[PDB]
Coordinates of C-alpha atoms in Angstrom, one line a residue:
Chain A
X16 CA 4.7 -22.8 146.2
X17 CA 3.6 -19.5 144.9
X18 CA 0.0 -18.5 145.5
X19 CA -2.6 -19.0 142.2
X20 CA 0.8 -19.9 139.9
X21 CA 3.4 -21.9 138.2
X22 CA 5.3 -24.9 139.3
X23 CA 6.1 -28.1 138.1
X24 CA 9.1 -29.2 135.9
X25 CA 8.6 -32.7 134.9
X26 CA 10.7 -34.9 132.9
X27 CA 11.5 -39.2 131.7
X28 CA 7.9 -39.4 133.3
X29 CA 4.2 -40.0 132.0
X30 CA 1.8 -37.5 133.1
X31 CA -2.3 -38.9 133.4
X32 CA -5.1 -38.4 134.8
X33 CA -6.0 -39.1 138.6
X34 CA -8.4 -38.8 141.0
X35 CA -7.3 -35.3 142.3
X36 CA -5.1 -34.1 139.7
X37 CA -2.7 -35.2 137.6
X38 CA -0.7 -38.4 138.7
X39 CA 3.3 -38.4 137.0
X40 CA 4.3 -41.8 136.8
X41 CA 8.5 -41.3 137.3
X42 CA 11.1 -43.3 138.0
X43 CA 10.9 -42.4 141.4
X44 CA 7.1 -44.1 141.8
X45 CA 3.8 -42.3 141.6
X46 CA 3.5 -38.8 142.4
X47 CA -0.1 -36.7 142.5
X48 CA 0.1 -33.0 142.1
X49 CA -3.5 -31.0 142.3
X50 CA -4.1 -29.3 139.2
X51 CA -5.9 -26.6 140.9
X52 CA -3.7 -23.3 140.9
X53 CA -0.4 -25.2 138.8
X54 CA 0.1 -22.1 136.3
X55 CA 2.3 -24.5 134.3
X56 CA 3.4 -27.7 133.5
X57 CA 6.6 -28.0 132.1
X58 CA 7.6 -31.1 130.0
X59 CA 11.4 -31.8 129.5
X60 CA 12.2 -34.5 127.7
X61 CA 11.3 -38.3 127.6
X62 CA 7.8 -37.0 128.6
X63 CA 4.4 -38.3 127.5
X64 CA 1.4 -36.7 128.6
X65 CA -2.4 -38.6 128.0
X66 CA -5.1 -37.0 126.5
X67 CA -6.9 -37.1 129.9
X68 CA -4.8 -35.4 131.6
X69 CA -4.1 -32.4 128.9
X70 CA -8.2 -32.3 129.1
X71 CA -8.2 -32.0 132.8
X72 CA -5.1 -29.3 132.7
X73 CA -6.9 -27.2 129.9
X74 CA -9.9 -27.6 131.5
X75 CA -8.7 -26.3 135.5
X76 CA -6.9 -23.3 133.6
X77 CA -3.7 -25.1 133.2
X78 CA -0.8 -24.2 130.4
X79 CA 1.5 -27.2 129.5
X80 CA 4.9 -25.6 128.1
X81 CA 7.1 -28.6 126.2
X82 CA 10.6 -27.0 126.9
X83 CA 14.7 -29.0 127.1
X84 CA 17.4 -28.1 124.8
X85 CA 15.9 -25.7 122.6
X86 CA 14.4 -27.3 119.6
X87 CA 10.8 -26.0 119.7
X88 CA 9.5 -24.1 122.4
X89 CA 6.0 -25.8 121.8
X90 CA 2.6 -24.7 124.4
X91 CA -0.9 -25.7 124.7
X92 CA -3.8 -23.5 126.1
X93 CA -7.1 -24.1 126.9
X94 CA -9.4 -21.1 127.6
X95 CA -8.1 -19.9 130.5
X96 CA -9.4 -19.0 133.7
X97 CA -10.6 -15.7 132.4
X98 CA -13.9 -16.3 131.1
X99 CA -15.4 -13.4 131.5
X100 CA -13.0 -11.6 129.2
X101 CA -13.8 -8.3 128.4
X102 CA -10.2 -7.4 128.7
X103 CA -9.3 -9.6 125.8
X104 CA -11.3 -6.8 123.6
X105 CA -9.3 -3.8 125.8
X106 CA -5.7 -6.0 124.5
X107 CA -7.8 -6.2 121.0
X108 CA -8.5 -2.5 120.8
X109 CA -4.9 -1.3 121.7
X110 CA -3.5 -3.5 119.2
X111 CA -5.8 -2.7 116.1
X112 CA -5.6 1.0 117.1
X113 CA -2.3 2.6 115.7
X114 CA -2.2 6.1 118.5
X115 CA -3.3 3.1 121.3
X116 CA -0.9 0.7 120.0
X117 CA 2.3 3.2 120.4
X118 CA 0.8 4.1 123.9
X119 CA 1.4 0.7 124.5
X120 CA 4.6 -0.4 123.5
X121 CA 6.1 2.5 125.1
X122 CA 4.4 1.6 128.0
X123 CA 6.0 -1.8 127.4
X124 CA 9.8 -0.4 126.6
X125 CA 9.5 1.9 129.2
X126 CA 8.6 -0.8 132.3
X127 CA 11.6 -3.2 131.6
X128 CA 13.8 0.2 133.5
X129 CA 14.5 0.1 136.8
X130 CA 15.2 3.7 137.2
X131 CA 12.1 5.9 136.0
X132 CA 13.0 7.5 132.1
X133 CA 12.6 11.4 131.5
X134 CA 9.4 13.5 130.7
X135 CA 8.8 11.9 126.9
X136 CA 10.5 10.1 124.8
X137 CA 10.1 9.1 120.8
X138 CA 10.1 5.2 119.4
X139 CA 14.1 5.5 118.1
X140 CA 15.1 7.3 121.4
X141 CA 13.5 4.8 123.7
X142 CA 14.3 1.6 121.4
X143 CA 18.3 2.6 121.4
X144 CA 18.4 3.6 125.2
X145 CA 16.8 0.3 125.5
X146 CA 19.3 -1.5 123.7
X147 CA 22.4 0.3 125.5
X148 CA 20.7 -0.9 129.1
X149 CA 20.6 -4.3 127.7
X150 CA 24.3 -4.3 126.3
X151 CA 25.1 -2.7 130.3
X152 CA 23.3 -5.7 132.0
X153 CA 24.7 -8.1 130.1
X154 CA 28.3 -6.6 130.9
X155 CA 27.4 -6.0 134.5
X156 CA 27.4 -9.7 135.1
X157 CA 29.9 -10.7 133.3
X158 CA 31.8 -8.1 135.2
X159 CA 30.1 -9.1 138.7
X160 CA 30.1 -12.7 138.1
X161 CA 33.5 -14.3 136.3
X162 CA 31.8 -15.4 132.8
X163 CA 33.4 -13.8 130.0
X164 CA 31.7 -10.8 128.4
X165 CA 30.6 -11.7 125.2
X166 CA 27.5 -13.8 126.1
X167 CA 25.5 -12.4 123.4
X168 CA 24.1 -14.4 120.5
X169 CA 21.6 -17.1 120.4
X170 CA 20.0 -19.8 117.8
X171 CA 20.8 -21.9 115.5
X172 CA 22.2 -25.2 117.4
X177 CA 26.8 -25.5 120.6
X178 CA 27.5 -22.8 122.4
X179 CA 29.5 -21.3 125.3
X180 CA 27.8 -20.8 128.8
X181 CA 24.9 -18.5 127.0
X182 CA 22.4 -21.7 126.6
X183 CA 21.5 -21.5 130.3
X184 CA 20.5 -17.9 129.2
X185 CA 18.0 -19.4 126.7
X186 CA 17.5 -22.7 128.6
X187 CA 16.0 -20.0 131.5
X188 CA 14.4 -18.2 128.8
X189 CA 12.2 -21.3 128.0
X190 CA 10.8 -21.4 131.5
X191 CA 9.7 -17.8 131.9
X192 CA 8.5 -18.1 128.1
X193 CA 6.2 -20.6 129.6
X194 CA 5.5 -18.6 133.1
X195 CA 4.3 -15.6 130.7
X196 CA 2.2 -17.1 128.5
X197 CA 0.7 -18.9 131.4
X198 CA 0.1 -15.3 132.7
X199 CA -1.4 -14.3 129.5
X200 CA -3.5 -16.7 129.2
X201 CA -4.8 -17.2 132.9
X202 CA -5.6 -13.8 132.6
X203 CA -7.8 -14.4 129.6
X204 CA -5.6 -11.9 127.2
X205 CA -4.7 -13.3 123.7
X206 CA -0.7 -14.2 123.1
X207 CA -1.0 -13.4 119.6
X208 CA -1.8 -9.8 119.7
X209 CA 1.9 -8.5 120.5
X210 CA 2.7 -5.2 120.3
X211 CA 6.6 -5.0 119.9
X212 CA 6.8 -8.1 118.5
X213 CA 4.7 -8.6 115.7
X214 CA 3.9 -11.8 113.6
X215 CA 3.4 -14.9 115.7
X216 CA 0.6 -16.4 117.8
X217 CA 2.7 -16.0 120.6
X218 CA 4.7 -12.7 120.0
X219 CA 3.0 -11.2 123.7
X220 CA 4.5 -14.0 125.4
X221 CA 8.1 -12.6 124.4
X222 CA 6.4 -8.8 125.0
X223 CA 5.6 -9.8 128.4
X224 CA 8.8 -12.0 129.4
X225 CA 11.2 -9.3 128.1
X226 CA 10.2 -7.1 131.1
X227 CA 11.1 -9.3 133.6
X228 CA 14.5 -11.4 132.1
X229 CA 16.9 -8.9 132.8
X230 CA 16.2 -9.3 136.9
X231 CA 15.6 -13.1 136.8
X232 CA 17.3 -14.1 133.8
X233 CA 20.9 -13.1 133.1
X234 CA 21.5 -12.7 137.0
X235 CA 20.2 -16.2 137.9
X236 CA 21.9 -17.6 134.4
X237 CA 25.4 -16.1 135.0
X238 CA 25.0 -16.6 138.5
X239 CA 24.9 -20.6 138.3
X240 CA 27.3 -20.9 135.6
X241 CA 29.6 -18.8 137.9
X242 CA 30.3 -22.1 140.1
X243 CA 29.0 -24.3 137.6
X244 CA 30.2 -25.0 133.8
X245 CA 28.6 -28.2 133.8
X246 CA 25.0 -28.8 134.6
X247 CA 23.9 -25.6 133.1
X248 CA 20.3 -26.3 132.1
X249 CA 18.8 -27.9 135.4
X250 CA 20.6 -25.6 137.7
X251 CA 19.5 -22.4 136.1
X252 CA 16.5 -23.9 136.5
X253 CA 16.6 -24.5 140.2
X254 CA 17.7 -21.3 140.6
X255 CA 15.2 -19.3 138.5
X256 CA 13.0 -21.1 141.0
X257 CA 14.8 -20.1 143.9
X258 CA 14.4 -16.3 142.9
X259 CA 10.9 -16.2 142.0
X260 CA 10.1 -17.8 145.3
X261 CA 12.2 -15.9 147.7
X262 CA 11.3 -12.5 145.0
X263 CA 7.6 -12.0 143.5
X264 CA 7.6 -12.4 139.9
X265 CA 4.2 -13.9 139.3
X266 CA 2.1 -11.6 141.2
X267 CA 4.1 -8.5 139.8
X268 CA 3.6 -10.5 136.4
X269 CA 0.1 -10.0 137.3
X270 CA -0.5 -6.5 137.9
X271 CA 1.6 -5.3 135.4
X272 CA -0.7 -7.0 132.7
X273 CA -4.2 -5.7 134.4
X274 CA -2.6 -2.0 134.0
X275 CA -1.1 -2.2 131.0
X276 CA -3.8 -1.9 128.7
X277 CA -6.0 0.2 131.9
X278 CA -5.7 4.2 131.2
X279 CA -5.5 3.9 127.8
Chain B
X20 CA -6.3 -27.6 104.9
X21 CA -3.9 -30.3 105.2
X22 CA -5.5 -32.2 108.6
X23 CA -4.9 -35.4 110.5
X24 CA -7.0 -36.8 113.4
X25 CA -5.8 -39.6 115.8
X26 CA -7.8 -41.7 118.2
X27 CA -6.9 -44.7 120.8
X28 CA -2.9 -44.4 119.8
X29 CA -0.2 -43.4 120.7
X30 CA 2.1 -40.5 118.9
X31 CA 5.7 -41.2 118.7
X32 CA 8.2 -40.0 116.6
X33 CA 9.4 -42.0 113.7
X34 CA 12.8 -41.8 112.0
X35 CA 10.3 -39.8 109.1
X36 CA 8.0 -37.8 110.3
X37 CA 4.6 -38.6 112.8
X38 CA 4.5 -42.7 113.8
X39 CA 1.0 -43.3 115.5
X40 CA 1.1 -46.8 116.7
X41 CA -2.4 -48.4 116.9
X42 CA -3.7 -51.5 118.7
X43 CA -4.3 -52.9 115.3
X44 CA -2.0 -51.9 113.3
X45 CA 0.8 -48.8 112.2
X46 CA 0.4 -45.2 111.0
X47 CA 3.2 -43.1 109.6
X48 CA 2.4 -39.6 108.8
X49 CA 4.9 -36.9 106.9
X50 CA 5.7 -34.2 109.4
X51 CA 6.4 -31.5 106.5
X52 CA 3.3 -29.4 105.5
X53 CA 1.3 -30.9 107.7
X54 CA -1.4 -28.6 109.2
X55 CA -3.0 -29.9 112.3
X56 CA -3.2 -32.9 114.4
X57 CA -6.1 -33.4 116.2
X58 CA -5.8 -35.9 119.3
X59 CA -8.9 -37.7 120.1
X60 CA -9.4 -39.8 123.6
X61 CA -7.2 -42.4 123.6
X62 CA -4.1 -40.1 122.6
X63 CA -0.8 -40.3 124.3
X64 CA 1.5 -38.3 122.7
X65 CA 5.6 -38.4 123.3
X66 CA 8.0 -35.5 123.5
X67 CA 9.8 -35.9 120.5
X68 CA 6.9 -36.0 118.2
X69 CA 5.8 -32.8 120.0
X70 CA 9.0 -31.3 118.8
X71 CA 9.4 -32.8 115.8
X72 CA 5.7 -31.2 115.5
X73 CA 6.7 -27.9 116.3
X74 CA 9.8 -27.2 114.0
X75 CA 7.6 -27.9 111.1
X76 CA 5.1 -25.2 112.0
X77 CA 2.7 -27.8 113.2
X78 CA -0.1 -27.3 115.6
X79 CA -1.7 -30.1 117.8
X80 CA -6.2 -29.5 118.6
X81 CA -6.9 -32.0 121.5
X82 CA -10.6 -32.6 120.4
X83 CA -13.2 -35.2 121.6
X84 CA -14.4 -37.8 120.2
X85 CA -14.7 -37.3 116.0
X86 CA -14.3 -33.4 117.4
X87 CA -17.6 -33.4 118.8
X88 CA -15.5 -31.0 121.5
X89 CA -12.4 -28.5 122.0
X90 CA -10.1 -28.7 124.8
X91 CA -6.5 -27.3 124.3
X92 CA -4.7 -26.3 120.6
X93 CA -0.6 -26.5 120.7
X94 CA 1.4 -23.9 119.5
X95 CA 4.7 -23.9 117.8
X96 CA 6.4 -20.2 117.2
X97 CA 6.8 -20.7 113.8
X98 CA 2.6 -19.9 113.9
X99 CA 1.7 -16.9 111.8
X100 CA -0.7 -14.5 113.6
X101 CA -1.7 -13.2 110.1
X102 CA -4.9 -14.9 109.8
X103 CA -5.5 -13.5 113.7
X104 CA -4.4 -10.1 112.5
X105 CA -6.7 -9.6 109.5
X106 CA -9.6 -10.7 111.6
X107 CA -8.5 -8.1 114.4
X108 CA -8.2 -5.4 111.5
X109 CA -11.7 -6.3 110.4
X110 CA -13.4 -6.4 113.9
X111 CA -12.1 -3.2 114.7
X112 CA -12.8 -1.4 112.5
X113 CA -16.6 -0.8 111.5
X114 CA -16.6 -0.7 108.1
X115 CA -14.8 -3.6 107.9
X116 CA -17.0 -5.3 111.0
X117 CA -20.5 -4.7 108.6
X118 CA -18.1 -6.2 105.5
X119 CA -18.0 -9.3 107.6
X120 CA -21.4 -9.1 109.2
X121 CA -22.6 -8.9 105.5
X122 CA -20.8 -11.5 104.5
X123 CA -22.0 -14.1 107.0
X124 CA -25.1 -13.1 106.2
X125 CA -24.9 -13.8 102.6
X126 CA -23.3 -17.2 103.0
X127 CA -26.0 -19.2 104.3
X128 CA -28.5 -17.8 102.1
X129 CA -29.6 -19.6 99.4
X130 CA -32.1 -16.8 97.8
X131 CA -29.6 -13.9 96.9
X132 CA -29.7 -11.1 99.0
X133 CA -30.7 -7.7 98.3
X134 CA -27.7 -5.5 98.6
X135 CA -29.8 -3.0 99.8
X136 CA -31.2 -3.7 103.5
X137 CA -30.5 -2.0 106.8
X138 CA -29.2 -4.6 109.5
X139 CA -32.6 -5.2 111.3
X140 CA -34.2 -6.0 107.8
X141 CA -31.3 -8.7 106.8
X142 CA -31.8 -10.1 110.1
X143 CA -35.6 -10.7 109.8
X144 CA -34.9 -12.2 106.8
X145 CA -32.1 -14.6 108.7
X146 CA -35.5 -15.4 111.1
X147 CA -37.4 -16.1 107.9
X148 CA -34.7 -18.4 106.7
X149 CA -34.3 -20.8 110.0
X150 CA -38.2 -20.8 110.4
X151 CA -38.8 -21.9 107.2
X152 CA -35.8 -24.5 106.9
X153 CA -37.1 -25.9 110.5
X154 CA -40.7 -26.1 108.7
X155 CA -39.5 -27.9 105.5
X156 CA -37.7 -30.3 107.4
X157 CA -41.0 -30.8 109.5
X158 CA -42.5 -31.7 106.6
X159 CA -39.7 -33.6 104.5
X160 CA -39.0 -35.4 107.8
X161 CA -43.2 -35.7 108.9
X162 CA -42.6 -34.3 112.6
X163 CA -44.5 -31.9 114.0
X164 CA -42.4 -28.4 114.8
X165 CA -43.9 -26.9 117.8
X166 CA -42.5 -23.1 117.8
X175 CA -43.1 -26.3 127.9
X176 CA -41.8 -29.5 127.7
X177 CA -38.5 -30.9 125.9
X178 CA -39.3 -32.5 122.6
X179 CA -37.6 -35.3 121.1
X180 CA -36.5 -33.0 118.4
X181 CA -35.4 -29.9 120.3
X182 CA -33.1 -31.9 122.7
X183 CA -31.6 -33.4 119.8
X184 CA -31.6 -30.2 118.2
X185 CA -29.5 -28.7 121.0
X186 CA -27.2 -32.2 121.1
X187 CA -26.2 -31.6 117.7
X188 CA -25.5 -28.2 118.4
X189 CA -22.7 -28.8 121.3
X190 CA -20.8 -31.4 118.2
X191 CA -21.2 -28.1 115.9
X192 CA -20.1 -25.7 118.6
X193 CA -16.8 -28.3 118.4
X194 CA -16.1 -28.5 115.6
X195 CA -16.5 -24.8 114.9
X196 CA -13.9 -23.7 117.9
X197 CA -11.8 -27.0 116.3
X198 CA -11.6 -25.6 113.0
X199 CA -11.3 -21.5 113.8
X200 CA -8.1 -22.3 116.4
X201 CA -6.4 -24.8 114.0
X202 CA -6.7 -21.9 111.1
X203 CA -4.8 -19.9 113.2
X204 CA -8.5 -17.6 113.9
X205 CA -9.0 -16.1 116.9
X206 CA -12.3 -17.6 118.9
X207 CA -13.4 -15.0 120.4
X208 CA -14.1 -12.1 117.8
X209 CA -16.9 -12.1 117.2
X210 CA -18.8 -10.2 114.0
X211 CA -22.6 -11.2 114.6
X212 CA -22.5 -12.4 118.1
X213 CA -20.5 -10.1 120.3
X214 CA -19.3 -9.8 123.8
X215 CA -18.2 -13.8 125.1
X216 CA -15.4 -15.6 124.6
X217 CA -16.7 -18.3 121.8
X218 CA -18.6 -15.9 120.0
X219 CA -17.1 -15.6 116.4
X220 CA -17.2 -19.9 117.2
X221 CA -21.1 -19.4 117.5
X222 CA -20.9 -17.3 113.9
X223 CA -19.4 -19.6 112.3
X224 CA -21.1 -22.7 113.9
X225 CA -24.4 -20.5 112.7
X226 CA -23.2 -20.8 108.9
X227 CA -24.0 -24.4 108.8
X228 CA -26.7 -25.1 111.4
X229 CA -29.0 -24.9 108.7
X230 CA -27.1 -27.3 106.3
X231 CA -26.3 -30.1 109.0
X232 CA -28.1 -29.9 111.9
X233 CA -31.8 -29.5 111.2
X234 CA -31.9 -32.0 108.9
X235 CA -30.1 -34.7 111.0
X236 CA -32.2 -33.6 113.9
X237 CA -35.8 -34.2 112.2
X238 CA -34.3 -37.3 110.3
X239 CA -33.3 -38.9 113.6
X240 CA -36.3 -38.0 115.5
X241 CA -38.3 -39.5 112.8
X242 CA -36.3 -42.5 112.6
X243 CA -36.9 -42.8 115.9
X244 CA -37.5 -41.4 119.4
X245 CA -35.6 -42.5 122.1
X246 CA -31.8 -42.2 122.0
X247 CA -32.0 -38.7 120.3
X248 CA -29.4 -37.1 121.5
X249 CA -26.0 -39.8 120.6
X250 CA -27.9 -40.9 117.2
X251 CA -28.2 -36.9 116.4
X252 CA -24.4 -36.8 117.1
X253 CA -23.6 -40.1 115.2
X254 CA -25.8 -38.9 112.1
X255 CA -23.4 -35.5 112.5
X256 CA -20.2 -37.1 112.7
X257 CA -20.6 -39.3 109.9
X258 CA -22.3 -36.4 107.7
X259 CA -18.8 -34.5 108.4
X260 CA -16.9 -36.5 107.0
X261 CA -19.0 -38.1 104.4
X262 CA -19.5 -34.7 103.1
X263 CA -16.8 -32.3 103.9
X264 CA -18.2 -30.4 106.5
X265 CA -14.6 -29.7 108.3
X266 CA -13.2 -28.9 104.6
X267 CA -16.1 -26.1 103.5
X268 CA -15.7 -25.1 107.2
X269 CA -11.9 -24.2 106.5
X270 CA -12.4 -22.3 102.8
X271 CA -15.5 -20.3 104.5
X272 CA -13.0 -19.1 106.9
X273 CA -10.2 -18.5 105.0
X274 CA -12.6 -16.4 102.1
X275 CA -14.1 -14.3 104.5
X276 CA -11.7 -11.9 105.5
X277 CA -10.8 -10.7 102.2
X278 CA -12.0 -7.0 102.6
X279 CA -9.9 -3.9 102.2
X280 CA -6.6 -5.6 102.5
X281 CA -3.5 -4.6 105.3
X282 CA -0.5 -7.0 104.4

């Protein structure tokens, strides 16, 4: 129930069109959810979703992120609510622009610290101080918070309590490219990650995982070992509602590429 | 390109690869290497053929009906933003933009082009070009072309134009193209979809248009739209759509 943005994790349901939004037929009977200021729809597994209603979701400025236990991370995006977007060409000319570009991934590296960084820093300097912060954080909570500390690596397929970091990391994938796109920007021009329609999407959710992610992720497997992916899940949801992530999301991506 | 549209199904998946399960019979579709898979109306597409989908580098284009329209594309992360990044490289940078301008000028003209011309003299000869195609096909088709009211013609002029606006936007976001760069038109969202739609205007719609408002004169606009539809897949309007787009960035080359 956060204002203008995301809820909505749906899964074993069919999702259609209704008069009013879009009507999930569950197990649990009919339910109607307006369409109008949903941010994202998130389909788990044993979903199917009807052309009508992905027309009406991409057409009210609606994302639909397929996410469960890894095996695709797969989105779909209409135009977005931005159409008037002239800031699409300000994300366009700080990507094509190598001095502009630089400006902004620092700008990028240098917002995922909580404590301001000194007077100027070079791409090396800031890229290992970066990566010394994110080895600290990830040892903080195993240190606060009982989990062992090597929660580290990721992919291919059968892990130890770290897939509720990644299962987590599929729902604010989806809340950030929801971002991107409700703000009419493009997720395919990223600027530290470089290569995939998407790569912004991971530009923009890397500055807000290590307050949301590996707390809420370590937190619930603290208490948990069991029931890793829904619970995280619950409480990623918890945090951004009693926190604001989606309105900071916000204004960090109008002033990002404003100043240049 | 290596396409697939779907209508009134429903997308599973199966044991293979893509299983679209139709009222009459069933489809089965190789998931590997395939390149997009447009969803018409009646789609209902499951979970695990969206994933299956997306670890093979697949995208899904929810179009209307025979991609008269675009709604929503589906990405998978295994998407390369290369075709995006050239086109970025060439619309920043000027010399690169006028490469492309040029270009889109030069592929819709039959007459060769000079070589020579400053940009307000290439686009008088771009008017010179539509005026005089809508006046042949006033006079192959025997319908007079008035240059207040809403003829026959110009309404169905315009209804073809919304299918080739479609299938434009279609085609540039199932390339992996970004919509919205714009070389000749600037400044909307949709614009570099109006270039290209531009590019074939000439080729598809005028004729259609004055054929069909000659043929007859009442139900312009969804005849117009059936005459379209059939002439892009008769001929292979979606297919010379997708090597025009991937020839014309091809400038001074960045990978």
């Amino acid at each position: 129930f956060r204002d203008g943005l995301s809820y909505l994790y749906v899964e074993h349901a069919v999702v259609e069109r209704e008069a009013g939004g879009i009507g999930i037929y569950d197990q649990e009977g009919l339910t109607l959810a307006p369409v109008a200021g949903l941010g994202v729809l998130f389909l788990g597994p044993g979903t199917r979703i009807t052309h009508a209603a992905v027309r009406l979701l991409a057409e009210n400025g609606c994302t639909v992120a397929w996410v469960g236990e890894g095996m695709a991370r797969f989105y779909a995006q209409g135009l977005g609510d931005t159409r008037s977007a002239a800031r699409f060409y300000r994300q366009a000319r700080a990507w094509a622009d190598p001095a502009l570009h630089l400006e902004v991934v620092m700008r990028l590296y240098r917002m995922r610290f909580s404590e301001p960084l000194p007077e100027g820093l070079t791409l090396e300097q800031v890229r290992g101080l970066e990566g010394v912060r994110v080895r600290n954080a990830y040892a903080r909570w195993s240190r606060e918070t009982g989990v062992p500390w090597y929660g580290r690596s990721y992919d291919r397929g059968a892990d130890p309590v770290n897939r509720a970091l990644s299962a987590g990391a599929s729902y604010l994938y989806g809340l950030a490219h929801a971002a991107i796109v409700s703000l009419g920007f493009s997720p395919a021009l990223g600027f530290i990650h470089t290569g995939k329609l998407l790569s912004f999407v991971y530009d923009i959710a890397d500055l807000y995982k290590a307050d949301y992610l590996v707390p809420a992720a370590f937190r619930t497997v603290a208490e948990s070992e069991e029931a890793v992916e829904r619970r995280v899940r619950r409480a990623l949801r918890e945090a951004i509602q009693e926190g604001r992530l989606l309105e900071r999301m916000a204004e960090d991506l109008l002033n990002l590429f404003r100043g240049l």
